[PDB]
Every structure is written in C-alpha cells, then in structure tokens.
C-alpha cells in the first residue's frame, strides 16, 4: 500500500519525506489556499512541492468546463513529469479524463462517493480514483464499505486504476484500507505521525534500554 | 514455518539445534543481560551464538538515534553473514532500516503491536517484522488477531517481509501462527520442548513396547 | 440509546439542550480546564452545568487515593442530585466505586480500554462504564470491537451497569454504538451537530418548498 | 406489516381500500399539488381522503419554523382523529415532534436517510419514522440496508416508533421490508396492484377453468 | 407439522387414514375432475371425503367473481364443519376471504407463488395459505426458498395464518418444510407412503427377525 | 442429557448403575439373544434388568403385525411400570404406537434413519424415537446430521417425544449429541466407561498425589 | 462472571480480597504444599483462608477411593460453610459427588479436560466443574474451545452446575471466558493484577493530572 | 486420495489386493504381534507383505534411541524398495527422520496427535505423517479437526509431506478425509470392505436384474 501526504504544508511534506514512508502528495484548492497567505503565491507552493516529492503530486484544476480543465491540466503537466491532474467526478470531468488519458497525462478523479462513480472514472481511463471516506462517515454511512465494494469491482474486471483512499480522518481508515487492499491512502500529517506510534513500543523501548545499562554502563554496543 | 529459539542461553541453543528443529535465534537486550552474569561478556555471547547457529541470529541495537543505529548495525553485520540487525519501530528505526536495506544488511523490526506498524516496517524494506503477541495478550487484546491481519495485508501487496511472531508464551500461539501462515515463530525453550510432546504419544509408545515383548523378550527388531 | 454531550463549554451545552437532543453531559479535567480561563473558576463551571442540564452530569475526581477519591466524590454528589462521580479504572478507583455504590452515589468508571476492565468496574457496582473508542483507534485497534465485546459480556451476566461509549470522534462511532446496543454515547459538540443532518434531507426540503409554491405562492 | 398507499389520487385510494389491503395513506406536498389542478383545492382533497380512509392519513406541514409547524399540526389534527402530522427531520421538526407527542398528536418524521436520524426522531417521541429507500438507491447506496439497521436499533432499545418505509419503487423493496420486519410500507398505486399478481397464478387459474369444464359444461 | 393428503381419490385417502398419519385433505378442480369419470359425480366425491376425513378438507371454488365465490363458499361450508374453502390469490379472492373470515368460514388461499402474495392473503384473514413449491421448481427457481421467507415474515408479525406447503413432488420438499417450520404439508399419495420407508429399516427388521430365531424358533 | 446403557449384559448394567451415571437401558433381540445362552432364558434376563434399573428399560416386540405387537406390548408393560416398548418404524408399528399411546404405555420407535421417519413417530405419540447414527456412518453418511435436523424439527413444533440417539459407536457421537441437545444417548458399555477418562486426568491425579506426599508422608488429609 | 484467586498464598489472598475484586479461592494439593514450608502446617493454611475469604474456598481431597473421599469431604465441610470440596473426575469421584450432593455439601469436580467429562460431573450433582484450559493449551489444543462447548451443553439442558474455568495462564483466557459466559474464572495472582491495567489508562491518568495543574497547582478538587 | 490397509493379516491383505482398491499397507508392533503366533515369525510376515503389496508398506522400528532407530531403519529399507520406515514422534525420532531423509530412505512419522507435531515431522523431512484420529475420538476430541488444520498448515507452506490419516474407525473418517483433501487414509479391513457398499446399490442391482428378465429370460 502506497502512502501519500494530504497537505500543501511544505514543512509537513519535508518532514514526512525525510522519514522515508511518504510516496507522494495530494493537494486541493482548500489545502493550497491555507498555505497561500502572508505573501506566498499558490504557484510557488505547487512548484516547491513538486521539487521536494519524488513521487506523484496531485494538483486540482479549478475550471468546471471541459475546455478549461484540459487547458489547465496541460499547464499542470508541464510543471513536472510527477504531476497528476486532479479532476472532479462530473460529466465534463469524465470527458477531460478521457482526453488527457490519450495524451498520457496522469489523472486523479476526486469527489467520488459511491462505487459506480469510481467505476465510471476507471472506464474513462483515470490513473487514480479518490473516494472520500471521512465525508461519508460525516453523513452517517461507513465510508470504508464503499472502498471494499470498489476493491471487489476493480478485481472483477482487472481494472488498472488505483484506489486512492482520501478524506482520511483516523488510523483505522488506514488499517481497514490495507486489509481491504486499497492501492493508496492519502493522510493528513497528524494521522501519518500517529501511524508509527504505540504505547507498548514506548514502554518496551524504555525497558530494554534500562536492562542494557546493567551490562553496559555507558549504554553503548561495542563489537 | 520456520521456528527460531528466543533465548541467549547457549545450552538451550545447542540442545535445540541438535534436535534439528531450530532454524535460527532471536535475542534482545534483556535476554542477553540474563546470560552476561559472572564474568561472561555480552560480546562473547553474541559471537558464540553466531558460531553455533547456522540460521539467522537477530541481535538488537541499543542506540535510539539513526546514526548510532546504522553504526551499530554495520558492526553487528561484520560479525557474521547470519547476523540480522534488530531495530525498534521508531522514526529513526525506519530511517535506519531503509539505509541498511540498501546496504544489503538484513534487518528485523521489533516492538510492533499493530498491523500498520508492521506495514510501515515492510515499506522501509525490513527483512523480518516481529509483532509481540504475548504482550498484547497481557493488555487484554488477543494478539493472534494482529498476526492474522498482517498476513492478509502482506498477501494483498505480495510483500516479501517475513512475519516473525514474537513474545510467544504457549503452544497455541504457535498452532494459530501456523494455521494463519506466519513465516516464522520465535519461541522460548520451554515452549519449544512442549511442541514435540503429547500424552497420547507417550502412552502409545509404552503400549507398543509391551505388545512387542509378547513377540520379542529383549525388545529388538531382528531383521 | 441516550446521547450525552462531552464538553464543559457552557455555550455548547446551552445550544445542545435547547435543541432537545441532549440527555446528559460528561466532563473531565482537560475539558473543564479548557473553560476555566480568563478569570473563570472551575467550581462555577461545574455548578452552571449542573443547573442547565436536567440529566446526568459526570464530574471527575482528581485525587488518586481511595480516601481522597471518596471525599471528593461526596462533595460532587452534594452539588446536585444529577451529579455522577467519574472515577478512573485503578485499584483505588474500584475500591472507591464499591464504597460509593453502597452509599447510593452514582458513579462512572473512566479510562477503560478493554472489556475485562469494564467487567471489573461493573463488579464494583459502577453506574456507568466509559470505554474510550477514539483513543483505541489512535493506537491502531478498532475501538468499536471493544464495545461489541462489552455488550455481549454484560448481556451474558444480566449486568445493570450502563455502557457509556466515550472518546467519540465521528458519527459512525455513534451508528455502530446504536447497532451494538450500547446504553449511552457521549459526543463532542461538532459530532452532535452532524447527527441531525443529511444532504438528501436538505435537498428534499428545498424541493418540497418549491413544489408547494405552485399551489400556494 | 401494514400497507399504506403513497398518493393523493382519490380514485387510486378508493380502488385500493375497496380491495381490503390498504391500511392507511401517506401524502406530501408534491403528491397533493399533482391532484390540486383543474379548480380542485388541496383542502378538499385532504378532507376527502380523511373521510374515505379508516386508517392513518399522513399530511405534511409546510412551515419550516417550530411555531408554524406546531400551529399547522394542530389544524391538521383538528381535521380528524386519523390524521397524522408529517414533519421533516430538522432541529425545529424534532422540537415540534416533542411538543406534539406531549399533546397526544400522532406524528410521522419524514426525509430520513440514515439510522441515526431515525433514532433521533424516535427519541423525540415520533409515532412513525419514514426512511426514503428509493432516493438512497438513486444515489448509489442500497436503501434497504438502512431499514435493516433501523430495525436492529429499534429492537435493541424496545423503541415503539413504527418504521414506515417510504420512497418505495418496486415490489422487492416491499418483500425486503417484510423479511426485515418493518412495521409499515407506503407504496405507489402501481406497486400496490403488482403485489397481488404472478404469472403462475394467472396460468393456474386458466388451467383449472379448463379442467373444470371437463366435469361441468 | 401437520400432514394432509393432496388427492381426490377415495381409496388413497381411506388407506392413508387407516395409517393414522394423515391430518386432513386438500383437493382442486383438476384432482376432482380426475375422479368424476365413468359416472361418478363431483358432489358425491366431496361429501365422501368430508365423511371419511376427521380433519380439515379444502374444496376449491370455481367462480372467479366475488359474489359467486362467496355464494359457493357458503354452500361448501354447509357440507360439514371441517370443510375449508379454497380461494385463489386474486383481487376478488382477497375480498371473498375477508368477507368469509368475518362470517367465521375457514379459508385456504391457493395459487400463491411468492411471499408477498402470502402476506396479502394473511392480511385478509385467511386460515391457510398454500404456496406451490413444485410449480416454482418447474420454472427453475427453488420453491422451498419461498417457504423459508414466508416463515420468517409470519414469525416477524406473529401471523396466525398457517403455511400449507402445496404442489409437493418429493420427500425433500417435506423434509425441508419441517426444518423450516411450515405448519402443514399436503402430499400426493405416492409421496406419503414413501415417507415411512428406508432401506436400512427394511434391512434391520430382516436381521432382527433372524436374530430372534436363535432364541425362539 | 440422559445416558442409557445399550446392552442386555447383567454385569455391565450392574456396574454402570453402581457408577450413578446410567439413567436406563435399551435392549433389542440381538442383544438379548447374546445373553440367552448357557441355560439362561430371555424372560429371566428382561425381568432381572427391570429389577436392577430404576429408569426406563426398552424391550423390543418381535411380532411384525399390528395385533401381535399390541399384545406383546401389553405383556411387556405388565412386567413393570419402568418398561418401555420398542417398536419398529413400519406402517403397523405406527398404528401400534398410536394405540399404545392412548393406553398410557410408553413406547420407543426404533430403526429410524432420517428426520421425517422420526417426525412420523412423534406424530403417532411415541415416547422416544431412536435414530441409528452408527448404521448411517456405515453407509457413508454422517449420522449425526440426522440428529441435528431432528432436534431442529422437534424444537420448531415443541414436540415432546425424546430424541434417543442409538447405534452409538464412539465418544464423539456422544459429544456431538450433547452439543446438538439430544434428550438421550444409549451407549455400549465400552463407550460408557471411556467417557470418564482422559490422559491428562490420570497424569494430573498422579502428580497431585506426589506433591501431597511432601507435606503429608502418610498421604492422608487430617483436619 | 465471578473471579476466584487460584493460590494458597495468604498475602496474595488478603491483597486481592481488599481490592474487592476476589469472589472466592481455589486451592489444590500442589498450591498448598508451596505454602506449607518452614513450620507452617497445611491444616493451618486451609483454616486461615476459610477465615479471610467470604466467598467459596475450594479444598481438594487426597484420597482416591470413594470412602476416603466422602470421609475427607465431610471433614472439609465441617471447617466452615464457605468450604467447597474439590473432587477429581474419576469413577469414585463421581460416586462421591452424588453422595455429597445429597448431603448438601458443595463440590467442585476438577481435572476435567473435555466437555463430556464436564457433563458427567454435572449429572452427578456437582456444584462447580473445573476444565483446565492451560494444560490443554500445553498439549496443542485450544483449551477455550472446550469451555465454549461446555457452555452450549449446559445451556441446552438448563444445567445448574457452574462452569469454573481453571488452569488459567493469561488475560485472554479470562476475556474469552467472559465472552463465552462461563460462570467463574479462577486466576493466579499475577494474572489478577494484570486485569486491572492498561497502558492507555496509565497515560491518560498522567495527562489529566498535568492538565489539572494548569488550573490548580496543588492538584486538588476544591468543592 | 490413496487408500492403504492397516493390518498385518496376510489373508486380509491378499483379499484387499485382489479387489484392486488397496494402494499400500501400514503395520505397527501390535498388528504384527497379532499375526506372529502359533509358530509364525515376525520377519516372515513382513517379508510376505512386502512381496504381496506393490505399493508402500510401512514397518515400525522398535528401538527408542537414535542410533538403534537408524540401524533398524536401514535393515527395513533393505527388505524391499517399497518399504517405508515408521518412526514415532520423539526427539530421537525426528533426528532419525532427518538422517534417513538425507539418505533417501522413505519415512512415516507416527503417534501424532496435534497439528504442530505433524509440522515438526514435516520439517524433519518425513515422507508421510500419520495423525491418529480414532484415539483422539476416544479421549473426547473430534480427531478429524486435527486433519483439517494439518491440511491448511501444509497448504500454507507448500509442504510435500503426505498426510496419512491413521487410527481410522469408520467410513465417515474416510469421507471427511477426502473432503478435507488428506493424501492417504489407512483403514482396517472391516472398514475397507464397507467402502464399496450401499443398500441402494444392492436394491437397484436386484431391480435391474428382474427388469432385464422381461426382455431376456
Ligand atoms: C526479538 C524480535 O524477534 C525477540 O527477542 C523479542 O524481543 C521477544 O520475543 C519479546 O518477548 P518478550 O515479550 O517475552 O520479551
Ligand atoms: C468522560 C467519560 O465518559 C469523558 O469526558 C471522557 O473523558 C472523554 O470522552 C474522553 O475523550 P478524549 O479521548 O477526546 O479525551
Ligand atoms: C390445494 C392448495 O393447498 C392443492 O390441492 C393444490 O392445488 C395442489 O397441491 C397443487 O398441486 P399441482 O402443482 O401438482 O397441481
Ligand atoms: C482447582 C479447580 O478449580 C484449581 O486449583 C486447579 O487445580 C488449578 O487451576 C489448576 O491449574 P494448574 O494447571 O496451573 O495446576
Ligand atoms: C501406522 C501409521 O499409519 C498405523 O498402523 C497406526 O499405528 C494405526 O493406524 C493406529 O491405529 P490404532 O489406534 O487402532 O492402533
Ligand atoms: C485529493 C483527492 O486525492 C485530496 O486532497 C482530497 O481533496 C482530500 O483528501 C479530501 O479530504 P477532506 O474531506 O478532509 O477535504
Ligand atoms: C411520506 C412519508 O411517509 C411519503 O409521502 C414520502 O414523501 C414519499 O414516500 C417520498 O417518495 P418520493 O421519493 O417518491 O418522493
Ligand atoms: C434400541 C433403540 O434405542 C437399541 O437397542 C438399538 O437397537 C441399538 O442401539 C442399535 O445399535 P446397533 O446398530 O449397534 O445394533
């Protein structure tokens, strides 16, 4: 399972990349606009993320009509070969995904909330499809059940579109995604950092170090 | 399923190896301090086990910082080709695993307590991951369910990291591990001895011997 | 299922209570210390919540010893009959719960993270037990499975302690609690506000509003 | 399971009551406005249905504020003892439901799309709750799963609110409601008539008729 | 589980009655028109079955219209108190069942092929409902599934209508009906006789016969 | 669950009754004819069993026609109120069961091999129905699945006939009967005696007695 | 679920009782010999536990013969009304249970290893039955599955004998027993202590205390 | 699935082999000492079975020490290429299996009673592992569940050791072994003879025999 960072915060991306467990980044207009304050411009933010992140960086078009989406997608593509164009699940979005797929421009269909939307995006040739599990949880349906159905549908037809679980809110979205077999999760920084932690890891590490000081006063391992 | 001995008692290790039922050994700072009493040095104990044991021997770093871990890891690797460097599940541990994996040094990520920690260790390139089922049992959650989820996750992504079940306390941890399909169990010596035994084996042996006396008084097979 | 509000924010409690969907309130030392700022005193906050909320109001002791816990629990009980004394799952806490239960002081055992702790709290006679599902989610275990096991255990032994699901983070903790059959959930205000809402409710209301205007401008 | 007709068409209602399988009627602003054409007024339509149907007749308020909903509800109730006041799942609607339930005015909470909304309506005291299965099917989720969850939740807490499955589109919504154990379904007239029919019933009747002409010309 | 005989053949009925394991009889116009040949009249056959069979005996109307069905049902009722009037699953049939139930005339709704038809018949007050499993088998659907669903639905609503499994073709229809918990099965005579038999019963008798000859010639 | 002894051997019955876990006895013409040798007559055997066993004793008619079965059943009944008349699943047997049931003579329908035979016997009013699990096993169908279906059928209709599992061959027929909820098992003596035994009981008892001799040399418990 | 302490250590028993979490005690000849060292008499140890403990106290006979068992049982009963006589699963044990049950002496049948032994002990009238789950684990079969079958069997026949799960080794034996619905668990002291504890309880307590210092420096609740 | 005959009775083996359904033979010291009576020597019995049976023939060592086991195993191997050396699951036995497997002497590990013993035997390289299902039945555990777990374990690790189900007591051990997918069953002669037979086979043959006589006396 690939793990992407769901943020436009440079310091978070830099930190998570330096950890070696971040395989790419997803952004959206809200995440970018949060960082586009105090003089910083959204063009600088996107270019700096593309520089820091070896893997896929998903950047969302703001146009809602087919022609503007394709024009924006080509400019996004030109920023670097690791850019992925994020396109909403709409009639014009599906037309744009089909056009861009023929041009070998990688795409990510967003604002997906049920399995048949995800299948339509795959049929248009999309590289990644992003169902939003947290926003389904918000309205009282367990969002992970949609990931499970999409995994089954995609397995049935040997679909090559990657499932990119998005709107992730807690580490059990991540656990269940991995047990289902989703291709990618994208997670806020607070979630990513919690994934490495467990109270019994901290307890056990401290205990081992104290056990060791009984045979090595300096605490070193000399061999 | 490979079976490792979880001990640094040299007498136990020799006895287990000579049954031919032991495929490797795991140690940790506690286990080694137990045997480093009354003049025996921890360096001597580690070197001896590496000599006696033909399979992998897992030896744990004691530094908590990345540089200290890679430095100690390279020294452990230099003691023998069967040495495996045991590295805790932490931010610096994951960084150390990725670097060492690139240097073709085998690694074992320890103090793992849930399936996503195990997945992160696999993503860093670790040779073995060791979830601690007995310490989960201690805090009232069935540790074998974590092994089951890790096996499913690893199957989903064709992950090559081996599942090394650790903190084993009884033969049912071993039985359930084999049914799940974990790659390795590491067991204390008293658990190892119990695995060969059953009261109906003992009874049946005794009976066949008495039956054979009716046809051969000396109890031999003359062919 | 009862729905409690997990906050000491008096403005949140007033709003939730005016909606009529809030059956009680839980607090803890963090929640209260979030409000007791810029002059406000914690004793005044607790008394104000006790006044606003008709239903149970949980207030946590701060002492860690049996004697201090019982003395604090008695002062809490005396602030109002709807007060419930929140007591951590410790050896001294179980002793305190047993004493307070014999004195007919209602109790709530908190910081519970597996089903056997919840059973011990019930054996001490506690009125409510609060397993923390979000903090279990945090450490990579589905916290709702612990609620499922506690419900089965309590059903097996006809236990009268109420399961009060706490550390709730989202509306699916609430849905799963109701399908399991937990007695109570306690929810932060953001979660409480989402429980009434659905986008098809909003859409359908707008549509019926336009439909009606055709026969009644 | 009770079976209500989901229409304001007086001819459909008369026909269906004349069959003996119609236990009540539901309406909404769309359904009434469809028949309030060619000089016919909505007040007369509602009154006519109330007279023809012995069972419950659900009539929706159009106000969106608490005070207007309660005032409308009391007028709807005055029209006849079998009137049930249909109220949307909103903050003001839950407030109106609690007030009306204390006045012993029967209520039906509408525009429900998940199980926790249904639980909130039952906590307010509503007589019926109407989850909309067809509109969930429309957005790609199997609406009958929501009914199954509500049935479990209501069984867990011995809830007396009746589950009134609404937005029914086909006979399998009806079959699945009965197997789940929903209290009521409300169905459009074309669904209702299809429920009595099966091709082997038709085939069997024709053969037995031909069989009987053998021994009785 | 009650066991009825599905025939109009007086000799089969007499034989199965002598066995003590036949609780009642069902007939239909095909079955009767098979026995009213070579001078035998259908009115004699019906009275003769009524006379032989202590338990319920179902006799089907031939009218298709409400008033004719009700008139015929009263004539069938007058023939003996154990007569049960078999009425098809149609609009007029449901109307007649309701009227006849109000007159305390027992009824059996026939030509039922899915669970919702069975539910409608129960709602009209019918004493027995007869789904036709063999004819469903004929068209490629496992007819016993329909029995399972009707059992679940009737349990859900504490329905007092008895499930009378009809169109039975083999002993596994009978086994499955009993495992589901259907109230009654009605069986053709060939099927009935087969239910008592098993080759290991035959073999064991013969061997005990030889065994006892070693001890008592 | 009641446990009956399936034998006509006086010494076995006496032994099992003295153990206090035998609630009655079933016989059949073969079992009796095995004991009716060396001068003993079958009438003496039956009367002696009826004397030893407080509970139900099932004795099989040898006639195959209705009138002879009822006449034999009345003579069997006259031997003692604890006698139960065993009658085969045949057309005449069912007629006899119905007649005897009206006369308040207890009955046991035997040679039952499927669930609908068992239901017909219950409808005739039989006190016990005896499906033969071992003889089904012999012909390649798992005989316990018939007990499970009979239990379900009888539960469905609140049938008061007791399920008396017969033709029992091993202790797992007995275990599965108890887990299903059959009313009675009838077991050969060899099976009954094995039911109390387990190798870990013997091992544990011996170990406890040796532990005790460390604090009480005589091996007694003085209080 | 009642919780008994499986020990004869008086200090453990006093400590456990004073937590109010201990409902009774079980002993056996081994456990008592452990505490009957350096002058302490086994009779004194038994009498003291009976004094300290308000709930049942199970004390095991050492005679293997029926007469010896009933004689010792009556003496054990005379020491206090809370005494329960522990009797092994044997032919003579079952006879002793039936006699003692008729004398209204409470009994506990021990060394049970499968569900039919447990059923036989219930048929003899035993107050408690003790299947040994840890010793089953030792010989490679999951002991908790035996508890599950016994609970089903007892439910089937409305058996009043209480299931007393014994040979408990870890907190998951306890968790699974409660989920199954066993009447009683008896646990060693180190397992008892572990049941109250969890690392997130410890962490959360520590955090609330630090949070409270921001509003109250002395860490008290002034009401 | 291979079917072996579990006996040293030469008459049983000849009969089973003449039927063509016997793929091999297992013996043990009890079975052989049952035959070596009234002058007959055990060495002659083993040699005669090796001659009659084309397939594998298992013969158990009697020594309990590694050195004696290997020396006995080598003499057994030299009696014929179809000989397989049966070795008990003990520490010395596992050592002997490992040595003999490296010498390409086929082995069978016996007295196995749980799935981890079977796994250890496979890790030592044993050709066949023989779990004892009837002796587990004797002590109140369903022995076939152990076969099910061993099959799953062996599938998990692509283990090439063959599962040889032993201590078989009835044809349902055989049926369940085949449904699980065990490689081999070894059966006593009484069981072997029952596997071909069914009363409906006997009945149908008699019936076709009579049917044919109508067209061919
Ligand atoms: C190394 C990881 O494979 C092992 O030595 C582990 O440290 C132990 O198995 C942990 O066991 P304990 O919980 O008994 O320390
Ligand atoms: C009291 C027990 O119901 C509550 O106030 C709990 O302390 C909180 O629900 C725990 O929540 P957090 O994990 O968010 O502190
Ligand atoms: C009356 C309803 O119970 C019965 O006589 C039915 O007509 C028959 O069981 C139907 O059987 P066929 O499909 O064989 O006509
Ligand atoms: C009495 C029966 O309830 C108990 O004392 C048992 O003897 C022990 O629980 C057995 O445990 P061990 O297997 O550890 O001896
Ligand atoms: C050898 C291993 O396959 C066999 O001869 C076994 O020893 C027997 O199958 C065991 O049977 P018993 O339990 O009847 O001795
Ligand atoms: C792009 C799709 O992969 C992501 O940035 C999504 O916009 C977010 O993950 C949505 O999360 P929120 O629901 O929290 O906005
Ligand atoms: C009232 C609630 O029982 C009903 O009239 C509902 O408004 C309808 O059943 C909704 O159906 P549509 O989705 O077709 O509007
Ligand atoms: C009477 C019915 O309870 C019993 O004696 C049965 O005849 C036997 O149990 C049948 O056993 P076999 O199949 O071994 O004869």
Swiss-Prot record, chains C, D, E, H:
Pfam families reported in the protein's UniProt record: TAL_FSA
Molecular function GO labels: aldehyde-lyase activity; transaldolase activity
Residues annotated as the enzyme's active site: 86
GO cellular component, one term: cytoplasm
Compartments, record wording: Cytoplasm
GO biological process, alphabetically ordered: carbohydrate metabolic process; pentose-phosphate shunt
Gene3D superfamilies xrefs: Aldolase class I
SUPFAM superfamilies reported in the protein's UniProt record: Aldolase
Domain of life, source organism: Archaea
Pathway: Carbohydrate degradation; pentose phosphate pathway; D-glyceraldehyde 3-phosphate and beta-D-fructose 6-phosphate from D-ribose 5-phosphate and D-xylulose 5-phosphate (non-oxidative stage): step 2/3
Any coiled-coil regions, as ranges: none
The reaction(s) this protein catalyses: D-sedoheptulose 7-phosphate + D-glyceraldehyde 3-phosphate = D-erythrose 4-phosphate + beta-D-fructose 6-phosphate
EC id: 2.2.1.2
Keywords: Cytoplasm, Pentose shunt, Schiff base, Transferase
Family as reported in the entry's similarity comment: Belongs to the transaldolase family. Type 3B subfamily.
Function: Transaldolase is important for the balance of metabolites in the pentose-phosphate pathway.
The name this protein goes by in its record: Probable transaldolase
Organism: Thermoplasma acidophilum (strain ATCC 25905 / DSM 1728 / JCM 9062 / NBRC 15155 / AMRC-C165)
Organism taxonomic ancestry: Archaea, Methanobacteriati, Thermoplasmatota, Thermoplasmata, Thermoplasmatales
């Amino acid at each position: 399972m690939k793990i992407f960072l769901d943020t436009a915060n440079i310091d978070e991306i830099r930190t998570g990349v330096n950890w070696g467990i971040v395989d790419g980044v997803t952004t959206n207009p809200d995440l970018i606009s949060k960082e586009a304050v105090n003089g910083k411009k959204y063009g600088d933010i996107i270019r700096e993320i593309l520089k820091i992140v070896d893997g896929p960086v998903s950047v969302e078009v703001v146009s809602t009509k087919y022609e503007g989406m394709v024009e924006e997608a080509r400019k996004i593509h030109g920023l670097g070969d690791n850019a992925v164009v994020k396109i909403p699940m709409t009639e014009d979005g599906l037309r744009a995904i089909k056009t861009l797929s023929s041009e070998h421009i990688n795409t990510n269909c967003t604002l997906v909330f049920n399995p048949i939307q995800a299948l339509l995006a795959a049929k248009a040739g999309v590289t990644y499809v992003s169902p939003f599990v947290g926003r389904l949880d918000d309205i009282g349906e367990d969002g992970m059940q949609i990931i499970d159905m999409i995994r089954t549908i995609f397995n049935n037809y040997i679909i090559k579109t990657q499932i990119l679980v998005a709107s992730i809110r807690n580490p059990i979205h991540v656990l269940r995604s991995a047990v289902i077999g989703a291709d990618v999760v994208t997670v806020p920084f607070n979630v990513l950092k919690s994934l490495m932690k467990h109270p019994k890891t901290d307890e056990g590490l401290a205990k081992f170090l104290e056990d060791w000081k009984k045979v090595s006063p300096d605490g070193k391992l000399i061999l």
